[PDB]
Structures are given as C-alpha cells and as structure tokens.
Design a protein around this ligand. Structure first.
Ligand SMILES: Nc1ncnc2c1ncn2[C@@H]1O[C@H](CSCC[C@H](N)C(=O)O)[C@@H](O)[C@H]1O
Ligand SMILES: Nc1ncnc2c1ncn2[C@@H]1O[C@H](CSCC[C@H](N)C(=O)O)[C@@H](O)[C@H]1O
Ligand SMILES: [Mg+2]
Ligand SMILES: [Mg+2]
Lengths: 242, 242
C-alpha cells in the first residue's frame, strides 16, 4: 500500500469507478467540483495526480463534501488520519475557522512534503500539528491524555485500510458526543458488494474483507448513528451517541 | 409528474441508476440502510413502492444521509418542499429534537395521507405543519412575514423539478446564514451528463435541462457554498454565506 507493502503496479482496483460512467463522474467534477476547488487544492491535486499512488487521492467532489460537513457542524478541532499528499487535510484546514486545530497523522512524512508547499501558500499550516507515525500508537497515547473538554469534533479516517476497526475503538472515545467520525473508501471500489471478488492483490483482498466486516459492524454498533454515502469510493459517516 | 401533468407511462428514466451496478446499491441498502431504518420508515417505504409514482421516492440510503446532516448541524426548524408519501418528511421529523418544527408543503395532500399513519405511529406528527399548496406562493408569503430570528436551519427541495431555480431565489432568503438548502435529484437519473439525451418525453427533458442549468448556476452562485453528492439520484447541498 501507500504507507508500506506492495507497489501500485501489482494492484488491480485502481481505475475502477463506482458511478455508472466516466462521463457522469466527469460531469460532476467539471460542473460542481473544480469551479469550487481552492487554487491550492487544485495545485496539490495536479501534482499528486502524477505520483505513483495517485489512486489513493481523495477526489475533488468528496473533498467539497467533507468541507460542507465540517462547516455545517461548526467543527473547530479535528484529527486527520492518513494524510498522503494532504488533499483532505488541506480541505479540512481551509474549512475550519482561523483558530481551528488539526492533528494530522501519517506513517510517511515524505508524502506530506509533496503537498505541504500548497498547504503553506493557502496560509493554513499553522492549524496543523503533523505527527509522523503509525496511527494506532498515537491514538492510544491520545486516549491516555485526552480530557473530555478536548475531544475532537471530527475525525477523518483514511490510513491502513485493514486497521479501521482498531481505529474505531479508539476514535469513539476521542471524538465528542455528537462528533463525527468518517471512514474513507468503505465501498472499496465497489468490490465489497460480493462475498468473493477475483483478480485482487492479496493486500486488496485483505482490505476488501476488512471493509465488509467493518461495514457490518458499524451498522450494528449502538455507540454511533451511521450513514454510508456513495461519494468517491464510499464514505461512512458516524456520529457518536454516547 | 406526481403533482401535475404527464403520467408515469411516459417516463423513460425510471429504471436507471447512477451507481455502476444494482448489486452495489443493494449492498449499501442491505448492509448500511435497512438495519438503521426506523420501522415506520420501512412501512412507509414498502407501501410507497407499490404506488404509481414510486420512482420519485427518496431512497433509504439517502434518507439516512439527510438524517445525519440534520443531526450534525443541530437543526431545529426546517422546511420540506415536495412531500409525496412522506419518506423524507418522516426522516426529518425523526431526526429533529422533540421541540423541532417542520413546515411541509405539497400540492397533493392525498399522497401525504398515505404516509400519515406511519408518521403518527412514529409519534412525530406534532412536529409537522402540512400545507396543501403549490410551494412558490407559500414561500413568497413566508418572505413577507419572516423575521430574522425565525429563519430556517434546513430546507429540502424536492417538488416541481422544472422550477428549482425559482425555489432557490426564495430559499436563499428563508434559510439562516450557515443554514442548509438541499436540492434533490440533481443528477436526474444520470441524464444531466450530456447536452443532448435521446428519447425522453417532454416533461423529463424539461426537468433534465432545468437541472443542467441549475447545477451550473449553483456552482456560480456567490450566495452559497455547494457540494453535489452522488447519493440517490444526486443531492446538492448548499450552505448560505450571506
Ligand atoms: N499504519 C498507518 N498509520 C498511519 N498512516 C498510514 C498507515 N498505513 C498507511 N498510512 C498512510 O495512509 C495514507 C492513505 S492515502 C490517504 C489519502 C488522503 N486522505 C487524501 O486526502 O488524499 C498513506 O499516506 C499512507 O502512508
Ligand atoms: N408546484 C408544486 N408545489 C408543491 N409541491 C409540488 C409541486 N409540484 C409537484 N409537487 C409535489 O412534489 C412531490 C415530488 S416527489 C417528493 C418525494 C418525497 N420528498 C420523498 O421523500 O419521497 C410530489 O408529491 C408532488 O405532488
Ligand atoms: Mg482514502
Ligand atoms: Mg426527489
């Protein structure tokens, strides 16, 4: 994957869309996303499109959806898990107020440095505390020091696909009651729709099975309300009830 | 359409899906929507599926998305434009707090009375002020009588598909700053993706062109931020800026 393991040349699902045609996706992006995309998000996206792991990039229509959610819920303190070149992170930082704060976590700071010049030109780096680490230890350590008054409003989870369930057990305690936890890529290119799905790299199959298990679990987890949204590669929004 | 004019026999787009496969939509509904769908929403949906205008029903995964937005933005006073049998209306009434208030508007009260037993059994009918009328005169009268402190938090727009642009001009004044206006069906069965589209009957084609114009207009409208979401048949979330 992006952070470790096999390279992109052996993956299979890279170019698969969940929408019914390339034309429909292109219509959405050209009509409703690109005209509303910040100049620095455009720049970060265009440089990322040339990178070997560009398939991992959060797309422009999903980005505006994340921004909309952040603004509607008046988020101020957030956590961003799985940064890559920083498209979703820059989206969050642009949406938050001037005194908003983001804890951003990625195992690979070199990816972050691809997009960091655009984050800086947007004038929002001051909102970001970037931590280079596997996410799980950071979440474990936040749990030990987290005060109820410091709980996050919003968490975007987009790191090791096979580890979402472990992230969830920490995050339901790190976001406030009424706060949002978003799991990215929960339809896994549409491959979750079937018990079996041939032609996958072993890492893709691990992630596919993980999402099928996670989707079933979140739908029955009494601690949250959920909405799985067929935007991008699928995004499951969770809202903490207690 | 459901409110006036052509019968469903004319309509050419009813069996289209914006997602790549029926199996993926079925997966979303069975895994993430139906287990979280209120029993009275299920009953209302199942009786509506047998109705002649079933194609116009808001789907269950979109419903949970509306509920999620309502709760995340802490909405308390809303307006529902285009009720039909009441699926999105019952969704809203269940999502709002006990003292939440909905102004619901539809030209056909007989559709509303199909869903009314389920709304009553859900115990949330007290939140709903139903007005049998075309929407525009009601909205215009609201603008005459509205005060700054009675602005709506949220509007769901799902009525005459050829007239959304006229609704928008009232609703950008009726919803509070920071409030949400949602336009339903903005991808119109995917048919907006092409300038010309074959074999539609006049009403479907008028609506298709209305949505192409609307999508372009909303993307350029400085009064709002937008996010067009590929859920259901397309939902465009607008957030009032000034
Ligand atoms: N165990 C782990 N802990 C933290 N980050 C991890 C991780 N395993 C993989 N990652 C990181 O997760 C990222 C997934 S791609 C994230 C995409 C990004 N959200 C966007 O907006 O485009 C990669 O950068 C990868 O380095
Ligand atoms: N001019 C108008 N003013 C108010 N309602 C109208 C209208 N023209 C059509 N309608 C109504 O708009 C509805 C569209 S279908 C609405 C679906 C509904 N929101 C759901 O949750 O499933 C129909 O009930 C129709 O009667
Ligand atoms: Mg992702
Ligand atoms: Mg509709």
């Amino acid at each position: 994957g992006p952070g470790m393991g096999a390279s992109i040349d052996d993956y299979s699902l890279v170019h698969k869309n969940i929408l019914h045609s390339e034309d429909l996706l292109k219509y959405i992006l050209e009509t409703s996303a690109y005209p509303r995309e910040h100049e620095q998000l455009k720049g970060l996206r265009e440089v990322t499109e040339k990178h070997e792991w560009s398939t991992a990039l959060v797309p422009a229509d999903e980005g505006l959806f994340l921004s909309m959610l952040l603004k509607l819920m008046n988020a101020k303190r957030t956590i961003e898990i799985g940064v890559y070149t920083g498209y979703s992170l820059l989206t969050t930082a642009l949406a938050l107020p001037e005194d908003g704060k983001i804890t951003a976590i990625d195992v690979n700071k070199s990816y972050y440095e691809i997009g960091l010049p655009f984050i800086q030109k947007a004038g929002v780096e001051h909102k970001i505390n970037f931590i280079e680490s596997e996410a799980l230890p950071v979440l474990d350590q936040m749990l030990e020091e987290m005060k109820e008054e410091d709980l996050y409003d919003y968490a975007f989870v987009d790191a090791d696909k096979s580890n979402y369930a472990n992230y969830h057990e920490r995050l339901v305690k790190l976001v406030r009651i009424g706060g949002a936890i978003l799991y990215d890529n929960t339809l896994w290119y549409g491959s979750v729709a079937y018990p079996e799905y041939p032609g996958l790299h072993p890492e893709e199959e691990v992630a596919r099975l993980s999402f099928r298990n996670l989707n079933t679990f979140l739908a029955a987890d009494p601690r949250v309300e959920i909405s799985q949204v067929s935007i991008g590669d699928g995004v499951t929004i969770c809202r903490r009830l207690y």
